[PDB]
Amino acid sequence: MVLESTMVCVDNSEYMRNGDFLPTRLQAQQDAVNIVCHSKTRSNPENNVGLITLANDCEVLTTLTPDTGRILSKLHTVQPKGKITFCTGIRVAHLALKHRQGKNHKMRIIAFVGSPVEDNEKDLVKLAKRLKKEKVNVDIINFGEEEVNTEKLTAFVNTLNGKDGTGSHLVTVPPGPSLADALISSPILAG
Amino acid sequence: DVPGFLQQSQNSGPGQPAVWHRLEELYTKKLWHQLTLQVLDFVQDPCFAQGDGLIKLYENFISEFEHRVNPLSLVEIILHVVRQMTDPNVALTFLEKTREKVKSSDEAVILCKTAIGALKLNIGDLQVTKETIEDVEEMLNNLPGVTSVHSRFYDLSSKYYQTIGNHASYYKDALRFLGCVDIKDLPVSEQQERAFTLGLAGLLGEGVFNFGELLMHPVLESLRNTDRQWLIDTLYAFNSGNVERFQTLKTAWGQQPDLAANEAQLLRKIQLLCLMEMTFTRPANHRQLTFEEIAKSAKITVNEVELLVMKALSVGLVKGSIDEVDKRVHMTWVQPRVLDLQQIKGMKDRLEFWCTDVKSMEMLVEHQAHDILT
Amino acid sequence: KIMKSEVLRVTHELQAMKDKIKENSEKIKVNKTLPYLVSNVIELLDVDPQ
Amino acid sequence: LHKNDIAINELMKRYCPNSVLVIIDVKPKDLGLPTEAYISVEEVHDDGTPTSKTFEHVTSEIGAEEAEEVGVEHLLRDIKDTTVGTLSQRITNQV
Numbered sequence: 001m002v003l004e005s006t007m008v009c010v011d012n013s014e015y016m017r018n019g020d021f022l023p024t025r026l027q028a029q030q031d032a033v034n035i036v037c038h039s040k041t042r043s044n045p046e047n048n049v050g051l052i053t054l055a056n057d058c059e060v061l062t063t064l065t066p067d068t069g070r071i072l073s074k075l076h077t078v079q080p081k082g083k084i085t086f087c088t089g090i091r092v093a094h095l096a097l098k099h100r101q102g103k104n105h106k107m108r109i110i111a112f113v114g115s116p117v118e119d120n121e122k123d124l125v126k127l128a129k130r131l132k133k134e135k136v137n138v139d140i141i142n143f144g145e146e147e148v149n150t151e152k153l154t155a156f157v158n159t160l161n162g163k164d165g166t167g168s169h170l171v172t173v174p175p176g177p178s179l180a181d182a183l184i185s186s187p188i189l190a191g
Numbered sequence: 192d193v194p195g196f197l198q199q200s201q202n203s204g205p206g207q208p209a210v211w212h213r214l215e216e217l218y219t220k221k222l223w224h225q226l227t228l229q230v231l232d233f234v235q236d237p238c239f240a241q242g243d244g245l246i247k248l249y250e251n252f253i254s255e256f257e258h259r260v261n262p263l264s265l266v267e268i269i270l271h272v273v274r275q276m277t278d279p280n281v282a283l284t285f286l287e288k289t290r291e292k293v294k295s296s297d298e299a300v301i302l303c304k305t306a307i308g309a310l311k312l313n314i315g316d317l318q319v320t321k322e323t324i325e326d327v328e329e330m331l332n333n334l335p336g337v338t339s340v341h342s343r344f345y346d347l348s349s350k351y352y353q354t355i356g357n358h359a360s361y362y363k364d365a366l367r368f369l370g371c372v373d374i375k376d377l378p379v380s381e382q383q384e385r386a387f388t389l390g391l392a393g394l395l396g397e398g399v400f401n402f403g404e405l406l407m408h409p410v411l412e413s414l415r416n417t418d419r420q421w422l423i424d425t426l427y428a429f430n431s432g433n434v435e436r437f438q439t440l441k442t443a444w445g446q447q448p449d450l451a452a453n454e455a456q457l458l459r460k461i462q463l464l465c466l467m468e469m470t471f472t473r474p475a476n477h478r479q480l481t482f483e484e485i486a487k488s489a490k491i492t493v494n495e496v497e498l499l500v501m502k503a504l505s506v507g508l509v510k511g512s513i514d515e516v517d518k519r520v521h522m523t524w525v526q527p528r529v530l531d532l533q534q535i536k537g538m539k540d541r542l543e544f545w546c547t548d549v550k551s552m553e554m555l556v557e558h559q560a561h562d563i564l565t
Numbered sequence: 566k567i568m569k570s571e572v573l574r575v576t577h578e579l580q581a582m583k584d585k586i587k588e589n590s591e592k593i594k595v596n597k598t599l600p601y602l603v604s605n606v607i608e609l610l611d612v613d614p615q
Numbered sequence: 616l617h618k619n620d621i622a623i624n625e626l627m628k629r630y631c632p633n634s635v636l637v638i639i640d641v642k643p644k645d646l647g648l649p650t651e652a653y654i655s656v657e658e659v660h661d662d663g664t665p666t667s668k669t670f671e672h673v674t675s676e677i678g679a680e681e682a683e684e685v686g687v688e689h690l691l692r693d694i695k696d697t698t699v700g701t702l703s704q705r706i707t708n709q710v
Contacts, residue, residue: 020221073577370663
């Protein structure tokens, strides 16, 4: 089947409980993690899935393991503190990819971004140059917005996305009362 | 009430629609955090405090049933409600209503009890307010040492400093206020009185012997250059030692209120500084001394030097016991506690001398000792 | 019911305890299998001065 | 001692009880005792600085209870015991 590692980064800021969008969509994207981890489990049960947030003091909630029975429990007690942290959020997983058991598992990291990015374009091109340098599959998922959706993140992805053939895809969700599961499951990354 | 809010929201004063445009846009967008930031922007602006009585209750209810944003903003805006209304009768029901409303998610009880005690620190009650202040400092001694809540605790120690009962605690918390300052963003025009009552409070502080901790930090000596140097001069003389009595006399009679009764105790405090400086000046070369330097530096008679050294031993800063027959002054361990540069350079001299002497003895004994014994 | 949503984590911890007691409770059968001899017991209360 | 040690130690402060810290050397060229016990406790500072994690030095001793003394003594066969007298005293008094 498919031998690859899955890393998800969820936001724990207070920007995920606003009443305009879904009713505390944290549970909705939790069900998204559930359907992508159970979908990858149905495709290849040997894939390991890690859990970590993007707070100031990043904490590894669950080590990379195919056993999601305790991951379902670890998805709770999100500790809604902090706002956003991007640099050590990338470096806390992309550098931790070397701690996986199976060396044949490809590198794939996703992230749920629910807060505006605090890093300037220089950090975007330095981190995009680092991720394109080490050649890690990066899927950017941006939930919620305050300013325009993609102004510098467009060039961030275009400069970050190498290997144009069957490479990485960008997930941009527009506002809407519909669920996010079917909207993020539309690309080829899910399934 | 959302469709019913557009009427009183749109209708406002002449300049209010400037913030009511983005306020109603963020209100229709239902962004509770941006709405909260706009509320803090409206409260932070120097409003006329005339037509805000409606938005205080409206945003009070919204902040009540929103159950999303940190209710500390509600604590601040309700401090502005009780500050604008000046009604302490309903303040207990309002703050208690916030206590009943705020669930057990974040430890905000330190700021809730801080606001309650702060409002109760008026002439109505003092003792129970001091007890609940001790409860505030007693509750949370955990890792969140942001010290901002503890800086408001320093404000409560200032309202407690309004009482002449205890001056020592305001200095102990005033060291924490000395160490918790981040930048000069807060108005310097207030820092004039902050350093004024901070210097006078440090002088009147009877729970400390040396003043070098206050003057040692550069933020105070850098924030006192604008003010008149009549206090910096007497703080440098009180720190570095009072060899004369004319300057300390003119500044001892310069501050008229509350300094007459405390003047004698301040003399009993500064009479030990010449002792610690006269015993830490000469580290070696006949440390033994006589009472002539004490009586000459303190312009006191020979009959009172026994009570002077008896008080010096009663304070506990010195352990000196003199086995003399004819009057002599032998001293022991003492702490400078402020600074000594000639003792830093002399520390390097005597330290390097000790090091090269130990090295000389090691090479001397080990030289032939290693060759004959190994 | 937002305050009662933390009970799920407690139930997950308790069912995790029931999932982890099977090993240390399973060694009871192999450690307490068979007492090979018989020994008489005489009760005598002692005092140490938990 | 790097700055990140407060975050590394903070995990075992949350999940585990108060953790002691030991700084050693990668090269055994230091003549001093390689082990230094640093307790992870927060102390109040007089200058007014905010309360932070402080590493106070706790004294340490290197001893073996029953077997490691025998194993070390057999593996070395070069070190000497206490041996009060001339050599063990004069070596300390020289070096």
